[PDB]
Design a protein around this ligand. Structure first.
Ligand SMILES: CCCCNS(=O)(=O)c1ccccc1
Ligand SMILES: CCCCNS(=O)(=O)c1ccccc1
Ligand SMILES: CCCCNS(=O)(=O)c1ccccc1
Ligand SMILES: [Cl-]
Ligand SMILES: [Cl-]
Ligand SMILES: [Cl-]
Ligand SMILES: [Mg+2]
Lengths: 115, 117
Protein backbone atom coordinates (compact mmCIF):
# COMPACT_ATOMS: atom_id res chain seq x y z
CA UNK A 1 0.00 0.00 0.00
CA UNK A 2 1.48 3.38 -0.85
CA UNK A 3 2.59 5.43 2.12
CA UNK A 4 0.37 8.08 3.59
CA UNK A 5 1.83 11.42 2.45
CA UNK A 6 2.17 14.24 4.99
CA UNK A 7 2.58 17.85 3.72
CA UNK A 8 4.94 19.25 6.37
CA UNK A 9 4.14 22.89 5.70
CA UNK A 10 0.37 22.24 5.85
CA UNK A 11 0.84 20.33 9.12
CA UNK A 12 2.97 23.04 10.69
CA UNK A 13 0.53 25.74 9.75
CA UNK A 14 -2.41 23.71 11.03
CA UNK A 15 -0.75 23.11 14.37
CA UNK A 16 0.17 26.76 14.82
CA UNK A 17 -3.33 27.95 13.94
CA UNK A 18 -4.92 25.54 16.41
CA UNK A 19 -2.59 26.68 19.20
CA UNK A 20 -3.57 30.36 18.76
CA UNK A 21 -7.18 30.33 17.52
CA UNK A 22 -6.08 31.64 14.13
CA UNK A 23 -8.49 31.66 11.17
CA UNK A 24 -7.79 30.88 7.51
CA UNK A 25 -8.90 34.43 6.69
CA UNK A 26 -6.12 35.79 8.93
CA UNK A 27 -3.42 33.64 7.41
CA UNK A 28 -4.65 34.60 3.93
CA UNK A 29 -4.29 38.31 4.95
CA UNK A 30 -0.65 37.78 5.99
CA UNK A 31 -0.07 35.97 2.67
CA UNK A 32 -1.18 39.13 0.83
CA UNK A 33 1.17 41.27 2.91
CA UNK A 34 -1.52 42.71 5.17
CA UNK A 35 -0.23 42.92 8.73
CA UNK A 36 -2.03 43.78 12.00
CA UNK A 37 -0.82 43.73 15.63
CA UNK A 38 -3.39 41.16 16.78
CA UNK A 39 -2.05 38.21 18.84
CA UNK A 40 -4.31 35.58 17.27
CA UNK A 41 -2.36 36.14 14.03
CA UNK A 42 0.99 37.51 15.27
CA UNK A 43 1.40 34.56 17.65
CA UNK A 44 0.70 32.25 14.69
CA UNK A 45 3.51 33.98 12.80
CA UNK A 46 5.87 33.52 15.77
CA UNK A 47 4.82 29.85 16.12
CA UNK A 48 5.49 29.12 12.47
CA UNK A 49 8.91 30.78 12.47
CA UNK A 50 9.83 28.86 15.60
CA UNK A 51 8.71 25.56 14.00
CA UNK A 52 11.19 26.20 11.17
CA UNK A 53 13.98 27.05 13.66
CA UNK A 54 14.02 30.64 12.33
CA UNK A 55 13.59 32.04 15.86
CA UNK A 56 14.18 30.77 19.43
CA UNK A 57 11.86 30.82 22.42
CA UNK A 58 12.43 34.59 22.84
CA UNK A 59 11.79 35.47 19.17
CA UNK A 60 15.46 36.09 18.49
CA UNK A 61 16.14 35.39 14.81
CA UNK A 62 18.76 32.83 13.85
CA UNK A 63 20.13 34.77 10.92
CA UNK A 64 21.95 31.82 9.36
CA UNK A 65 18.77 29.74 9.22
CA UNK A 66 16.72 32.70 7.99
CA UNK A 67 19.20 33.50 5.17
CA UNK A 68 19.23 29.77 4.48
CA UNK A 69 15.65 29.89 3.16
CA UNK A 70 16.65 32.03 0.19
CA UNK A 71 18.46 31.40 -3.05
CA UNK A 72 22.09 32.53 -3.50
CA UNK A 73 21.01 35.48 -5.69
CA UNK A 74 18.95 37.01 -2.85
CA UNK A 75 21.52 36.72 -0.03
CA UNK A 76 22.85 40.29 -0.26
CA UNK A 77 19.36 41.80 -0.36
CA UNK A 78 18.29 39.66 2.60
CA UNK A 79 21.45 40.59 4.57
CA UNK A 80 20.58 44.26 4.04
CA UNK A 81 16.99 43.79 5.31
CA UNK A 82 18.33 41.88 8.36
CA UNK A 83 20.74 44.75 9.06
CA UNK A 84 17.79 47.12 9.30
CA UNK A 85 15.40 44.82 11.16
CA UNK A 86 17.50 42.77 13.62
CA UNK A 87 17.72 42.33 16.49
CA UNK A 88 14.00 41.90 17.11
CA UNK A 89 12.24 43.97 19.75
CA UNK A 90 8.75 44.17 21.20
CA UNK A 91 6.61 43.56 24.24
CA UNK A 92 6.28 39.79 23.85
CA UNK A 93 7.20 37.12 21.31
CA UNK A 94 4.16 37.84 19.16
CA UNK A 95 4.73 41.64 19.10
CA UNK A 96 8.43 41.07 18.33
CA UNK A 97 7.37 39.17 15.21
CA UNK A 98 4.74 41.77 14.25
CA UNK A 99 7.43 44.42 14.42
CA UNK A 100 9.83 42.26 12.41
CA UNK A 101 7.23 41.58 9.72
CA UNK A 102 6.40 45.29 9.43
CA UNK A 103 10.09 46.16 9.15
CA UNK A 104 10.68 43.48 6.48
CA UNK A 105 7.63 44.71 4.55
CA UNK A 106 8.70 48.39 4.69
CA UNK A 107 12.33 47.57 3.86
CA UNK A 108 11.50 45.55 0.73
CA UNK A 109 8.02 46.80 -0.25
CA UNK A 110 8.22 45.27 -3.73
CA UNK A 111 8.31 41.65 -2.55
CA UNK A 112 6.80 39.52 0.17
CA UNK A 113 8.03 36.04 1.03
CA UNK A 114 5.70 33.44 2.54
CA UNK A 115 6.23 29.82 3.57
CA UNK B 1 1.37 54.01 2.02
CA UNK B 2 0.94 50.27 1.52
CA UNK B 3 1.20 48.98 -2.06
CA UNK B 4 0.49 45.37 -2.96
CA UNK B 5 3.77 43.45 -3.06
CA UNK B 6 4.57 40.65 -5.47
CA UNK B 7 4.11 37.56 -3.28
CA UNK B 8 6.51 34.62 -3.44
CA UNK B 9 5.67 31.23 -1.95
CA UNK B 10 9.01 29.79 -0.79
CA UNK B 11 7.89 26.21 -1.42
CA UNK B 12 6.73 26.96 -4.96
CA UNK B 13 9.84 28.96 -5.75
CA UNK B 14 12.13 26.31 -4.29
CA UNK B 15 10.51 23.51 -6.31
CA UNK B 16 10.77 25.55 -9.52
CA UNK B 17 14.42 26.46 -8.83
CA UNK B 18 15.46 22.96 -7.80
CA UNK B 19 13.68 21.43 -10.82
CA UNK B 20 15.53 23.75 -13.18
CA UNK B 21 18.93 23.30 -11.54
CA UNK B 22 18.80 19.48 -11.60
CA UNK B 23 17.03 18.66 -14.85
CA UNK B 24 14.08 17.12 -13.04
CA UNK B 25 10.86 16.40 -14.98
CA UNK B 26 7.37 16.98 -13.61
CA UNK B 27 6.76 13.21 -13.75
CA UNK B 28 9.77 12.72 -11.50
CA UNK B 29 8.58 15.32 -8.98
CA UNK B 30 5.18 13.63 -8.97
CA UNK B 31 6.92 10.33 -8.22
CA UNK B 32 8.88 11.94 -5.32
CA UNK B 33 5.62 13.34 -3.96
CA UNK B 34 4.16 9.80 -3.85
CA UNK B 35 7.32 8.26 -2.29
CA UNK B 36 8.73 6.49 -5.35
CA UNK B 37 12.42 7.01 -5.79
CA UNK B 38 15.24 6.05 -8.03
CA UNK B 39 18.97 6.56 -7.46
CA UNK B 40 19.30 9.08 -10.34
CA UNK B 41 20.71 12.58 -9.65
CA UNK B 42 17.85 14.34 -11.41
CA UNK B 43 15.68 12.96 -8.61
CA UNK B 44 18.06 12.69 -5.65
CA UNK B 45 19.79 16.07 -6.11
CA UNK B 46 16.32 17.66 -6.50
CA UNK B 47 15.37 16.15 -3.10
CA UNK B 48 18.68 17.34 -1.65
CA UNK B 49 18.02 20.82 -3.00
CA UNK B 50 14.56 20.98 -1.34
CA UNK B 51 15.97 19.84 1.99
CA UNK B 52 18.83 22.36 1.82
CA UNK B 53 16.33 25.19 1.14
CA UNK B 54 14.94 24.66 4.67
CA UNK B 55 18.36 24.04 6.37
CA UNK B 56 17.52 20.36 6.87
CA UNK B 57 20.96 19.60 5.46
CA UNK B 58 24.23 21.42 4.74
CA UNK B 59 26.21 21.48 1.50
CA UNK B 60 28.20 18.49 2.75
CA UNK B 61 25.32 16.02 3.31
CA UNK B 62 25.05 16.59 7.07
CA UNK B 63 21.40 16.45 8.10
CA UNK B 64 20.21 18.59 11.01
CA UNK B 65 17.88 16.25 12.95
CA UNK B 66 16.80 19.00 15.36
CA UNK B 67 15.47 21.22 12.54
CA UNK B 68 13.74 18.17 11.02
CA UNK B 69 12.01 17.10 14.22
CA UNK B 70 10.53 20.60 14.64
CA UNK B 71 8.72 20.37 11.29
CA UNK B 72 7.13 16.95 11.88
CA UNK B 73 3.60 16.71 13.32
CA UNK B 74 2.91 15.85 16.93
CA UNK B 75 1.41 12.43 16.26
CA UNK B 76 4.60 11.28 14.44
CA UNK B 77 7.21 12.59 16.90
CA UNK B 78 7.92 9.31 18.68
CA UNK B 79 8.13 7.34 15.42
CA UNK B 80 10.16 10.04 13.71
CA UNK B 81 12.69 10.17 16.56
CA UNK B 82 13.17 6.42 16.34
CA UNK B 83 13.45 6.29 12.56
CA UNK B 84 15.92 9.17 12.41
CA UNK B 85 18.00 7.58 15.21
CA UNK B 86 18.31 4.51 13.00
CA UNK B 87 18.94 6.29 9.67
CA UNK B 88 21.35 9.09 10.63
CA UNK B 89 24.06 10.08 10.12
CA UNK B 90 23.99 9.84 6.35
CA UNK B 91 26.16 7.45 4.37
CA UNK B 92 26.69 6.98 0.66
CA UNK B 93 28.82 7.56 -2.43
CA UNK B 94 28.25 11.31 -2.86
CA UNK B 95 26.03 14.15 -1.60
CA UNK B 96 22.88 13.21 -3.54
CA UNK B 97 23.31 9.41 -3.00
CA UNK B 98 23.49 10.03 0.76
CA UNK B 99 20.02 11.57 0.52
CA UNK B 100 18.82 8.60 -1.60
CA UNK B 101 20.02 6.20 1.09
CA UNK B 102 18.37 8.28 3.83
CA UNK B 103 15.06 8.22 2.00
CA UNK B 104 15.32 4.46 1.45
CA UNK B 105 16.19 3.88 5.12
CA UNK B 106 13.20 5.89 6.30
CA UNK B 107 10.89 4.04 3.89
CA UNK B 108 12.17 0.65 5.04
CA UNK B 109 11.74 1.63 8.70
CA UNK B 110 8.32 3.30 8.33
CA UNK B 111 6.75 2.08 5.05
CA UNK B 112 3.47 3.91 5.71
CA UNK B 113 4.92 7.41 6.29
CA UNK B 114 6.22 9.82 3.65
CA UNK B 115 6.74 13.56 4.14
CA UNK B 116 6.79 16.20 1.40
CA UNK B 117 7.37 19.97 1.27
C1 LIG C 1 9.35 37.44 7.65
C2 LIG C 1 8.31 37.73 8.70
C3 LIG C 1 6.91 37.31 8.29
C4 LIG C 1 6.71 35.86 8.65
N1 LIG C 1 5.52 35.27 8.08
S1 LIG C 1 5.21 33.74 8.43
O1 LIG C 1 5.13 33.59 9.86
O2 LIG C 1 3.99 33.36 7.79
C5 LIG C 1 6.38 32.77 7.89
C6 LIG C 1 6.95 33.00 6.63
C7 LIG C 1 7.97 32.15 6.16
C8 LIG C 1 8.43 31.09 6.94
C9 LIG C 1 7.86 30.86 8.19
C10 LIG C 1 6.85 31.69 8.66
C1 LIG D 1 14.84 41.11 -1.02
C2 LIG D 1 13.69 40.33 -0.49
C3 LIG D 1 13.43 40.71 0.96
C4 LIG D 1 14.00 39.68 1.92
N1 LIG D 1 13.13 39.46 3.04
S1 LIG D 1 13.65 38.68 4.33
O1 LIG D 1 15.10 38.71 4.33
O2 LIG D 1 13.11 39.34 5.47
C5 LIG D 1 13.13 37.17 4.43
C6 LIG D 1 11.77 36.91 4.41
C7 LIG D 1 11.30 35.61 4.53
C8 LIG D 1 12.18 34.55 4.69
C9 LIG D 1 13.55 34.80 4.72
C10 LIG D 1 14.03 36.11 4.62
C1 LIG E 1 13.37 11.45 3.72
C2 LIG E 1 13.86 12.63 2.90
C3 LIG E 1 12.72 13.60 2.64
C4 LIG E 1 12.43 13.70 1.15
N1 LIG E 1 11.18 14.37 0.89
S1 LIG E 1 11.16 15.79 0.15
O1 LIG E 1 12.27 15.83 -0.75
O2 LIG E 1 9.90 15.98 -0.52
C5 LIG E 1 11.24 16.96 1.24
C6 LIG E 1 10.59 16.83 2.46
C7 LIG E 1 10.66 17.86 3.39
C8 LIG E 1 11.37 19.03 3.11
C9 LIG E 1 12.01 19.17 1.89
C10 LIG E 1 11.94 18.13 0.96
CL1 LIG F 1 16.93 38.95 16.69
CL1 LIG G 1 12.76 43.90 23.29
CL1 LIG H 1 5.48 32.15 -5.79
MG1 LIG I 1 22.32 27.40 2.48
Amino acid sequence: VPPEVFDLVAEDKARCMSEHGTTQAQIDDVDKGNLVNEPSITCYMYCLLEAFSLVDDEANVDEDIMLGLLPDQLQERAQSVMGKCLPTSGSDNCNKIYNLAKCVQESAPDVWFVI
